[PDB]
């Protein structure tokens, strides 16, 4: 996909969204 | 430090480690060595201040030479040079005396973060409450 | 000791830290000293404070009075000598991985660690954990997934 616009939001986000996101991410790939 | 082993505080002076009458020969004599209390202690002396009392531990078995830890002041002391009066009573504690700066008694409290339990550091003071209701001297809170 | 009225407090206090709660452990203190607490409790002080606790009561007749509850992995631990911590905010963290570290200081057995509660299960230290915020090692997975 377009990199750059997974790049602004991929580097500024908030927190707990986060903690019930990359316990996971793991899953998809890996 | 997961064992002791050694260890008599005897309050110390800083300004110059070469006692011999209050302590002098008795802080070192029993595999101990008097020649290294004025080469290393000074130098862990000066760094901070000088003068006043230096309870203390030393890493001596029967290993010749040694290491020296350092310690903390007296807390009911803090309220000498941290307080006013130097004494206690003067009128037996059948009559309740001294007299407090409640201001002070936390971060003169505070001073001795490293030697105690309590979490919250009002608790730290908590305790100087009755560390300095140690004759019944009311504090102007 | 007190009547009830005082070990139901033990109770509905110690349960709602279930209820409320977040990872748990195991420990079996036949020798705890108290520079053994001292130490814990400023790890409890990294971990927060009096966040985390540790309240000896594996009277079954206690902290299995707060299982039946959630955790009825434990009916299983409460025999013989335990050492209960709960975790309220904090990772499923290292907590975890200190009670391993500290036994494997001597410092006293660690029931073998009969472990607990998470998912629903038994024993093996993990520090499957604080990484957790190591999303950084979902950052890295960025540039270097771009690049290479």
């Known amino acids: ?30 | 430090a997961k064992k002791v082993q050694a260890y008599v505080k005897l309050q110390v002076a800083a300004g110059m480690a070469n006692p011999s009458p209050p302590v002098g020969p008795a802080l070192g004599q029993q595999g101990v060595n008097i020649m290294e209390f004025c080469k290393a202690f000074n130098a862990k002396t000066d760094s901070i201040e000088k003068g006043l009392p230096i309870p203390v531990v030393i890493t001596v078995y029967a290993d010749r030479s040694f290491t020296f830890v350092t310690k903390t002041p007296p807390a009911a002391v803090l309220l000498k040079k941290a307080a006013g009066i130097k004494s206690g009573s003067g009128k037996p504690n059948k009559d309740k005396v001294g007299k407090i700066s409640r201001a002070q008694l936390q971060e003169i409290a505070q001073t001795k973060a490293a030697d105690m339990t309590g979490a919250d550091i009002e608790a730290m003071t908590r305790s100087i409450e009755g560390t300095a209701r140690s004759m019944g001297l009311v504090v102007e809170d | ?148």
Request: proline letters at 3%; hydrophobic letters at 50%; aromatic letters at 6%.
């Open chain 1, 1 to 30: 996909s377009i990199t750059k616009d997974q790049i602004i939001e991929a580097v500024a986000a908030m927190s707990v969204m986060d903690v019930v996101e990359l316990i996971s991410a793991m899953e998809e790939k890996f």
């Open chain 3, 1 to 148: 000791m007190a009547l009830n009225l005082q070990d139901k407090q033990a109770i509905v206090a110690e349960v709602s830290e279930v209820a409320k709660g977040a990872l748990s452990a195991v420990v079996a203190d036949s020798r705890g000293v108290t520079v053994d607490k001292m130490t814990e409790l400023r790890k409890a002080g990294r971990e927060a404070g009096v966040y985390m606790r540790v309240v000896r009561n594996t009277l079954l007749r206690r902290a299995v009075e707060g299982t039946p509850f959630e955790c009825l992995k434990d009916a299983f631990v409460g025999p013989t000598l335990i050492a209960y911590s709960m975790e309220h905010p904090g990772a499923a963290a290292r907590l975890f991985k200190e009670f391993a570290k500290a036994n494997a200081k001597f410092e006293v057995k660690a029931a073998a660690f009969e472990g607990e509660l998470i998912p629903a299960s038994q024993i093996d230290r993990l520090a499957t954990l604080p990484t957790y915020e190591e999303a950084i090692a979902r950052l890295m997975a960025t540039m270097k997934e771009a690049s290479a």
